[PDB]
Amino acid sequence: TFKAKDLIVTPATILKEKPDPNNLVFGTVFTDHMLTVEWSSEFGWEKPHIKPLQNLSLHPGSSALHYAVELFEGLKAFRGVDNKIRLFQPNLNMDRMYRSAVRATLPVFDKEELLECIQQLVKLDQEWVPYSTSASLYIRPTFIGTEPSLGVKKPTKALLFVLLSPVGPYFFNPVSLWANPKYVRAWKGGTGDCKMGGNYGSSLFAQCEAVDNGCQQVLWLYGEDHQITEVGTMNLFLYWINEDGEEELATPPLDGIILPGVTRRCILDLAHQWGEFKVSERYLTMDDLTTALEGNRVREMFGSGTACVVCPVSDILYKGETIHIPTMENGPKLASRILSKLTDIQYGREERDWTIVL
Amino acid sequence: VGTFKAKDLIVTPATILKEKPDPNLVFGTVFTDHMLTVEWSSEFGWEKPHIKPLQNLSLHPGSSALHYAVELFEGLKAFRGVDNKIRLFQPNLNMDRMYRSAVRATLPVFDKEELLECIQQLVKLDQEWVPYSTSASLYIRPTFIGTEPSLGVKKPTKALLFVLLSPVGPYFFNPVSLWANPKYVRAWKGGTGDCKMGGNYGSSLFAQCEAVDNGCQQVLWLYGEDHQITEVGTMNLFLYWINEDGEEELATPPLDGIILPGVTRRCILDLAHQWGEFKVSERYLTMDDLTTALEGNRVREMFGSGTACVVCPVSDILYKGETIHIPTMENGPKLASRILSKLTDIQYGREERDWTIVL
Ligand SMILES: *Cc1c(COP(=O)(O)O)cnc(C)c1O
Ligand SMILES: *Cc1c(COP(=O)(O)O)cnc(C)c1O
Ligand SMILES: NCC1(CC(=O)O)CCCCC1
Ligand SMILES: NCC1(CC(=O)O)CCCCC1
Ligand SMILES: [Mg+2]
C-alpha cells in the first residue's frame, strides 16, 4: 500500500477562477489539482501524486474501457459557518470503496492513507470549497483497471485517482419518476450493492426513456411483485401510515440489490433517535403504494444521497397513468427536518461525531 | 444524427514499425503498428476517421466510460487463407451487434458499412501481422466509449470509437472444468446481458478468480430457481445429447434476454439445421436436466462457442461440493471436432462459402 507521507506535489502554475456558487451544474466544473497513484502487480503501489488537473494517459486496451473494471465514490467537503472545512462520515466511504475494490478484484489500499491523501488534496485546493451554506465540494475517488491485455482477468496494472468538483444541487425541487418494470437496475447475485461502473452504464437507456416521457429520474422496480427499490440512483424513503395503521418511515432492506448509502444510514439513525414514528427496513411494492395513496395514507416520498442529501418526489408515471404523490402539499415536513438536520451537522452549525475537521 | 465515412480516412503511417511476434502468442497481449480512432461530439457529430500509430488514449479524468461504464466492444478475426488471401468472417453480424449495442448504451449510431470498410483499411495496412500460421489469426477489437467530461449520469455528449489489432493463437482441444456457484448471476431479465457492453464483464472477475482457486478454468453461469445453465464463462453453451424423449439433440439456451447472441452460436445452429442429422433445439437447460441425463448415459458432449476458442470442450462441472464429469472427451468429441474443422476450413479459405469476405 502507498503512504501519504510519500506524497509528491506539483502545483499548477496557473490557477483557475472559482465559479459562481448560485448556479452550478453537478460535476461539470473541476478544481486545479487531482490525486493520482499508480499500481502494478509487479512492483505494487508507486508513490501518490498531487498534480495539476490533466488528462489521463491510458493504453487503449485498459480493462476499464473494455470490461468495466472500475469503481468510484462520492463524498463532500463543507465550509463550516465558523469557516472551518469539514468532511462528512469520510471513513464510511473509504470502507465502501475498499469492499468494492475487493469484489472488483482491484488492488487493496490502506484506507487511512487514502483519506489522508484526499485531505491533502482538498487542503491544497481548499479555496474551491465554496463560501456558501447551500453549496459544497464534491470529492470523487475513482479506481480503474489499466490492464493492457484484452484477456478477461484480474488486472495487473491499475490507477487510483481523485477529482474535486464544486457543486450546488444535483438536478425543494420535486421530481417525477418513470416506472417501467421492463428494465432492472440490479439483481440478486449481482453487484448492485457496490459503486462499480457496470451498474450505471446499463441504466442510461431507461434514464433517457424517462426524460423524453416527462420525468427526471427512474423508479427502479424489481421482481414479480414490482418492489420499489431506488429513486434514480438514490435510496428510496416512504413516509406514511402503514397497513397496520401506524405512522412509519420505510426504506427497502439491504438484501443485495440496494446500495448502502451513507445518507440512507444517517436518516435511519436520526429517525431511530427521534423515536417519533416507526422506522422499518422493509419491502415496498407499487401496489403497497397505490393502495396506500387511494386511502390517503402517504405523506412523503423522497430519495436520499450525498449530492441532494434528500430529494422529494411528487409524481410517478406507471401503467400509462400519472400517480400524484402528496409529498409537497405535506410540507414536506420530514424531508425538510431531515435536510435541515444533516446540513446543520455538515456545516458545523451543530457538533456531532459525523464530521471531520480540516 | 449521422455517420463518419471511410472515404474521409486520414492515414498516418508509423515511422518505427514493431517486429511481428512468433505465430506460436498470448491472447490480446501483442498489438499491431496502427489503430483506428474516430471522435464524436453531440455538437458537431462524427469527425473524420483516422488510422494512426498505436498510442495511449488521452482521456479527461471525468470520462463517463471510467465512472459509469459507458462502453461496449466487439471481437472478430481476420485469417490468412491457405491461398495467402486474408479473410474476414461474418463481419456484418459483428457490425449489427455493435450497432444494437451502441443504441442500448445510448452511445451514437453510425453507418455499419462505413465502419466495416474502415476496418478493412486498418487490417489492409497491417496485414503482415495477420499470422503466417493456420492455427493463428489477428483479433480485431472495435471499442466504443463515452468521453463525457462530467460526473452526471447521462447520455454522453462526447464519444470515442477505435479499433485495436492483436495477433493471437488460442484463448487459454483442451477441455475445461467449470465452477458452478448459483450465488453469482451474470445477467437478469431487463438488463443488458444480451449486448457486449463492458458493464456485464467487470462484475464477473470475482467469480472467475473463485473458479481458478477451485481448479476450474471457467465459470458456469446459473440462473433462476431451477438453476438453468446459460453460458460457459463468456461463451455460448451447447449440449449434444439424448433428450427426455430419446431423441438425439443439439441443445442451447434461447435468446430470452440473458444470453448473448454469439456469431459462433449462429453458425453452429445454421450448420446443425443444415445437416439435418438430429434435432436442433433452442430451449431451457437445467442442472437437474444435466444430472438426470448424466446418470442415464444420455450426454454425448458439452462445449462453449465463441470467437477466441471457436469451440471449447467441457469435461467437468463443480457443483454443490461435488465434481461432475462430462464424457465430452470420451465421445470424440465427434460433434465438437466436426464443428471446429468446418468453421476453420471456411475461415482459412479451405472451403468456399458466403460467410467470408476477402480483402
Ligand atoms: C451512491 C449511491 C446511492 C447513495 O449513497 P450515498 O452514500 O448516500 O451517496 C444510492 N444508490 C446508488 C445506486 C448509488 O450509486
Ligand atoms: C462475445 C460473447 C460471446 C460470443 O460471441 P461470439 O460472437 O461467438 O464471439 C458469448 N457470450 C458472451 C457473454 C459474449 O460477450
Ligand atoms: N444519484 C447520484 C450519485 C449519488 C448521490 O450523491 O446521490 C450516484 C451516481 C454518480 C453521481 C452521484
Ligand atoms: N469468451 C470470450 C470473449 C469472446 C470470445 O471471442 O469468445 C468475450 C469477453 C472478452 C474476450 C472475448
Ligand atoms: Mg497503516
From Swiss-Prot, chain A:
Tagged with keyword Amino-acid biosynthesis: yes
Superkingdom to which the source organism belongs: Eukaryota
CDD domains documented for this protein: BCAT_beta_family (cd01557)
Catalytic reactions of this protein: L-leucine + 2-oxoglutarate = 4-methyl-2-oxopentanoate + L-glutamate; L-isoleucine + 2-oxoglutarate = (S)-3-methyl-2-oxopentanoate + L-glutamate; L-valine + 2-oxoglutarate = 3-methyl-2-oxobutanoate + L-glutamate
The EC number(s) this enzyme carries: 2.6.1.42
GO biological process: branched-chain amino acid biosynthetic process; branched-chain amino acid catabolic process; G1/S transition of mitotic cell cycle; L-leucine biosynthetic process; L-valine biosynthetic process; lipid metabolic process
Cross-referenced Gene3D superfamilies: 3.30.470.10, D-amino Acid Aminotransferase, subunit A, domain 2
Entry similarity comment: Belongs to the class-IV pyridoxal-phosphate-dependent aminotransferase family.
Subunit structure: Homodimer.
Protein name (database record): Branched-chain-amino-acid aminotransferase, cytosolic
Species whose genome carries this gene: Homo sapiens (Human)
Name of the gene this protein is made from: BCAT1
